[PDB]
Amino acid sequence: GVTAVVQKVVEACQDESKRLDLIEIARSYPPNQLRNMQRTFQAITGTFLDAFLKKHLSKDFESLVLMLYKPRAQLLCELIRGATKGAGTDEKCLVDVLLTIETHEVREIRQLYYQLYNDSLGDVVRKDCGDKYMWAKLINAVATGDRIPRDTHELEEDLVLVRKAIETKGVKKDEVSTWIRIFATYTRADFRQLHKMYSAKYNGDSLRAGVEDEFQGLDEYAFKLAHDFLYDPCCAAAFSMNVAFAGSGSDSNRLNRITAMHFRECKGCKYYYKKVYGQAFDERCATELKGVYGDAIKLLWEP
Ligand SMILES: [Ca+2]
Ligand SMILES: [Ca+2]
Ligand SMILES: [Ca+2]
Ligand SMILES: [Ca+2]
Ligand SMILES: [Ca+2]
């Protein structure tokens, strides 16, 4: 019963030992029911859940929980807003969000973004990022474009063109269109087919290795992330989590958005994490994160 879940939330907030109940609730019920629960929460208590969570929680666990108890499309918009409004740009955030949402989800947030902010999502991103850097071109094309099915003939053409691109040092002028067309506009099915055609034709060489060769820095992250997401969203989740853990400390902001955006659907993340990085996800978590925050991240990713 919704009114009882409300009680469970209140108690998880008011007892130090019950904090992980917030994560259990988030993972155990569908989004529509969480949204409905929150409406009952305010009806009963007189305060919005968001404000309530803020009064009782702190630091990384607060930031994470606030993200989980939002409709996901609203979360995507807030992240994009947060990354662009005012001085500078959170480029990592934009890449993470834009490149890991399905085409229909992009259309949904274009519409929502305008309702929330009276701004065009595409315009906001282009204004902030420009259209010069390859990561910028990529996210612009995804922000304003569509992923459309194409004929096998087109895949065969593109195979030769991407190989050519991979073979030349640096992104050449005539290569820009190739990288953007494939990574911004291929459907998952077509991308998966090209991925297979490439390794078959080129003695087991991979598109992902070609991306590594061609790009550096944020460009390389962006194209690997688009690669992995098209190949399998669970791969992309593991890659983004690994990157967030990399180096001294870790990027809790990135861990939080990747986990809130993807835990629900990307159940194979832990499998891919171990397969690719050779260490169990929970073991990396153990050495990176502490306390209730670490326990939260491990539990959300547990299928
Ligand atoms: Ca607080
Ligand atoms: Ca800005
Ligand atoms: Ca090249
Ligand atoms: Ca490189
Ligand atoms: Ca680290």
Domains in the chain: boundaries = 1-303
CA–CA dist 144, 104 (Å, integer): 12
Resolution of the structure in the document, Å: 1.6
Give 300 Cα–ligand 3 centroid separation in angstroms: 40
Token pair, residue 209, equals 């290795």
Give 212 Cα–ligand 4 centroid separation in angstroms: 4
Burial letters 89-98, b for 16+ CB under 10 A, else e: bbbbbbbbbb
Give 62 Cα–ligand 1 centroid separation in angstroms: 7
**Residue 48 near residue 58 (C-beta atoms within 8 A):** no
Angle between helix 281-288 and helix 233-245 axes, rounded to 10 deg:
30
CB-proximal residues (5 Å) to ion ligand 4: 212, 216, 220
Contacts of 162 (CB under 8 A, 6+ apart): 178, 179, 182, 194, 198, 207, 210
Report the structure determination method: X-ray
Give 63 Cα–ligand 1 centroid separation in angstroms: 9
Closest ligand to residue 169's CA: 3
Q: Exposure of 295 by Cβ count < 10 A (0-12 exposed, 13-18 middle, 19+ buried)?
A: middle
